Structure 1
Amino acid sequence: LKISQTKYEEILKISKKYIFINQVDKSFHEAVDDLNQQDFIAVSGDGANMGRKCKMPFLVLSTDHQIYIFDIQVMQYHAFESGLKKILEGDSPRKIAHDCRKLSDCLYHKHNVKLKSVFDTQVGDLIITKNKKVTLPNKVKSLGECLTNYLGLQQNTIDEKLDIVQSTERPLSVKIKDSLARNIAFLHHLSEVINEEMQLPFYRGVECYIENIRSSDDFKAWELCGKLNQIPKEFRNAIDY
Structure 2
Amino acid sequence: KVLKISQTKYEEILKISKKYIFINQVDKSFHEAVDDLNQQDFIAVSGDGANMGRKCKMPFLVLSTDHQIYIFDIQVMQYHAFESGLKKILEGDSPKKIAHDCRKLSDCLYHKHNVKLKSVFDTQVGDLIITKNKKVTLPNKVKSLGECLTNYLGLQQNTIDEKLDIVQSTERPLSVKIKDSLARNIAFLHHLSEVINEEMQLPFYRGVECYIENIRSSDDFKAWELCGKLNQIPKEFRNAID
* TM-score, length basis structure 1: 0.88
Measure the CA separation in 1 of the matches of 2:195 and 2:187. 14
> What is the Cα deviation at residue 207 of structure 1?
3.6
> What is the Cα deviation at residue 231 of structure 1?
13
> What is the Cα deviation at residue 227 of structure 1?
19
Measure the CA separation in 1 of the matches of 2:19 and 2:226. 51
What are the Cα deviations for residues 157-188 of structure 1, in whole angstroms up to 9, with x where unaligned?
A: 00011011100001011000000000000011
What are the Cα deviations for residues 184-223 of structure 1, in whole angstroms up to 9, with x where unaligned?
A: 0001110000011011222214545887999899999999
Instruction: Pick one of 11, 14, 20 that aligns with 1:12.
Output: 14
Higher mean C-alpha displacement, 133-142 vs 221-230? 221-230
Q: Against the structure 1 CA distance between its residues 202 and 66, is the aligned structure 2 distance closer, same or farther, given a 3 Å change threshold?
A: same
> What is the Cα deviation at residue 133 of structure 1?
1.0
Residue aligning to 1:150: 152
Q: Against the structure 1 CA distance between its residues 224 and 26, is the aligned structure 2 distance closer, same or farther, given a 3 Å change threshold?
A: farther
Residue aligning to 1:98: 100
Measure the CA separation in 2 of the matches of 1:223 and 1:133. 33
Q: Against the structure 1 CA distance between its residues 52 and 213, is the aligned structure 2 distance closer, same or farther, given a 3 Å change threshold?
A: same
Q: Which runs of 5+ in 1 are unaligned?
A: none
Measure the CA separation in 1 of the matches of 2:38 and 2:126. 24
Once the two structures are superposed, the pairs formed by residues 28-43 of structure 1 within 5 Å of their partners are 28-43=30-45
Residue aligning to 1:216: 218
> What is the Cα deviation at residue 152 of structure 1?
0.2
| SS of 1:45 mapped into structure 2 | coil
Measure the CA separation in 1 of the matches of 2:40 and 2:226. 39
| SS of 2:22 mapped into structure 1 | strand
Q: Against the structure 1 CA distance between its residues 238 and 155, is the aligned structure 2 distance closer, same or farther, given a 3 Å change threshold?
A: closer
Instruction: Pick one of 134, 151, 159 that aligns with 2:136.
Output: 134
Measure the CA separation in 1 of the matches of 2:39 and 2:232. 38
Higher mean C-alpha displacement, 52-61 vs 231-240? 231-240
| SS of 2:98 mapped into structure 1 | strand
What are the Cα deviations for residues 99-137 of structure 1, in whole angstroms up to 9, with x where unaligned?
A: 000000000000000000001111110111100111111
Measure the CA separation in 2 of the matches of 1:172 and 1:80. 20
Q: Against the structure 1 CA distance between its residues 144 and 235, is the aligned structure 2 distance closer, same or farther, given a 3 Å change threshold?
A: closer
Measure the CA separation in 1 of the matches of 2:180 and 2:18. 7
| SS of 1:161 mapped into structure 2 | coil
After the TM superposition, which parts of structure 1 deviate over 4 Å for at least 4 consecutive aligned residues? 208-240
Q: Against the structure 1 CA distance between its residues 94 and 222, is the aligned structure 2 distance closer, same or farther, given a 3 Å change threshold?
A: farther
Identity %: 100
Measure the CA separation in 1 of the matches of 2:63 and 2:215. 44
Once the two structures are superposed, the pairs formed by residues 35-74 of structure 1 within 5 Å of their partners are 35-74=37-76
Residue aligning to 1:22: 24
Higher mean C-alpha displacement, 81-90 vs 200-209? 200-209
Q: Against the structure 1 CA distance between its residues 172 and 208, is the aligned structure 2 distance closer, same or farther, given a 3 Å change threshold?
A: same
Higher mean C-alpha displacement, 226-235 vs 124-133? 226-235
Measure the CA separation in 1 of the matches of 2:35 and 2:221. 53
Measure the CA separation in 1 of the matches of 2:164 and 2:20. 18
> What is the Cα deviation at residue 138 of structure 1?
1.1
| SS of 2:43 mapped into structure 1 | strand
Q: Against the structure 1 CA distance between its residues 123 and 22, is the aligned structure 2 distance closer, same or farther, given a 3 Å change threshold?
A: same
Q: Against the structure 1 CA distance between its residues 237 and 98, is the aligned structure 2 distance closer, same or farther, given a 3 Å change threshold?
A: closer
> What is the Cα deviation at residue 224 of structure 1?
16
